[PDB]
Design a protein around this nucleic acid. Structure first.
Length: 428
RNA sequence: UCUUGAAGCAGCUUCCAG
């Protein structure tokens, strides 16, 4: 059914910013000579019509209450023109407040179809690398990672790394209040504070990017090459034991780089030290300089077959493994770091990677990750590698610019009728 | 039917060769 956001009444995902901009009423509005739509003003306007329809259904009508009782001055504005004019008059504290309400309204990581309509027309953390590469879209007119990976590694971080600090597992969609052309979601964040007032980001916190490599998913069999390397690591955890574990497969997660000699889009980890030898250019060089100092944190998890189901840190050590600044993950965490900074006005960012093993017949049915239980269908976690990510300001600014120009070019090509005013956007 | 090329959201997936 044709989902109309200007009406008075799956199909919830078809309430896009693309559908809003392509709509006849908006098309007739842009047709006037005086009309020069700016960003984030049009995005903020779209956010009203989206929540005037979805808001009542999804329970909380807080987004529209702020828009009407503080942005429209009690008036329940109905037409595009009035809503845009009121939205263009919004101050930064007001745009930020709407963005937070939207984030709390979409606090269900990836189960609401609102999330689907919200992502469209925005450069998301995942999609960021593609946008900076300038490759083809932004405007478009399964759980084999959520349950199987994210959940497991999240619980691992929640109960083993930060079981003392107050943490937040599920974050909503964080649209950029400064531009409205960027939007991220946080996998996990630890040591967070709450107002009165909802959640608030503190520069003394750690934001995690939960990703995991099932390349190393081995089976407890004498023959198995990965299992052989893991056993050596389990009863002797160290820098050298990790090297055997990583080079136990044909396409490894670690890569050797000469004198900062440039890596490849192979994987997320990279090592510059001798012991790991196995067999825009300038922007890459600037990033390598910043990431080659802080070591990766490696967690060897206890075997539930040996520790009566209780998975905990058997041993923890440091590895000279750094983030691949060419790989997607770096750019994904870059965009996320940029929006966190915006919602503030710094937190430490990391890539938490899980390493597993197949569940055997002799493995306990009921397993516990510190305090909370593990699903009997999912694979057993054996290792956790926490990699710090550092972003040089100059490089971060240069990249966000390239992506913004790509958004500017695509939005002007996809929507020819809209007399876009990117002079207002030029600030961010 | 597998491993070595390449390509994209994590494993798979999409085009090959031998």
């Amino acid at each position: 059914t044709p989902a109309d956001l200007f009406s008075e009444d799956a199909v919830l995902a078809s309430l896009s910013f693309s559908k809003f901009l392509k709509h006849a009423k908006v098309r007739d509005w842009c047709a006037q000579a005086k009309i020069q739509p700016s960003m984030p003003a049009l995005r903020m306007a779209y956010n009203y019509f989206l929540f005037s329809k979805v808001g009542e259904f999804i329970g909380s009508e807080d987004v529209c209450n702020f828009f009407v009782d503080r942005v429209f001055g009690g008036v329940r504005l109905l037409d595009v023109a009035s809503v845009y004019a009121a939205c263009s008059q919004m101050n930064a504290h007001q745009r930020h407040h709407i963005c937070c309400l939207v984030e709390r309204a979409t606090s269900s990581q990836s189960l609401n179809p609102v999330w689907d309509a919200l992502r469209d027309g925005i450069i998301s953390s995942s999609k960021f690398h593609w946008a900076v590469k300038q490759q083809n879209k932004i405007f478009s007119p399964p759980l084999a990672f959520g349950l199987r990976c994210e959940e497991v590694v999240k619980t691992l971080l929640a109960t083993l790394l930060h079981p003392d600090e107050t943490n937040c597992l599920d974050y909503g969609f964080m649209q950029s209040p400064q531009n409205g052309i960027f939007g991220v979601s946080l996998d996990f964040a630890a040591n967070v504070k709450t107002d009165t007032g909802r959640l608030q980001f503190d520069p003394n916190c750690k934001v995690y990017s939960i990703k995991c490599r099932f390349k190393y998913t081995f089976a407890k069999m004498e023959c198995d090459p990965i299992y052989a390397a893991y056993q050596r690591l389990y009863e002797a955890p160290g820098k050298l034991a990790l090297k055997d574990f990583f080079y136990s497969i044909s396409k490894p997660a670690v890569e050797y780089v000469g004198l900062g000699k440039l890596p490849s889009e192979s994987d997320y980890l990279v090592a510059y030290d001798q012991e790991w030898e196995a067999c825009l250019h300038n922007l890459i060089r600037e990033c390598i300089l910043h990431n080659s100092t802080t070591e990766s944190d490696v967690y060897v998890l206890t075997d539930p077959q040996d520790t009566r189901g209780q998975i905990s840190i058997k041993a923890r050590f440091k590895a000279n493994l750094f983030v691949n600044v060419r790989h997607s993950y770096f750019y994904q965490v870059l965009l996320q770091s940029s929006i966190v900074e915006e919602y503030i006005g710094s937190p430490k960012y990391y890539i938490a990677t899980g390493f597993f093993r197949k569940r055997g017949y002799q493995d306990p049915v009921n397993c516990t990750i510190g305090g909370d239980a593990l699903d009997p269908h999912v694979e057993i976690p054996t290792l956790l590698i926490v990699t710090p990510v550092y972003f040089p300001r100059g490089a971060k600014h240069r990249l966000l610019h390239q992506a913004a120009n790509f958004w500017s070019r695509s939005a002007k090509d996809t929507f020819p009728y809209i007399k876009w005013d990117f002079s207002y956007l030029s600030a961010n």
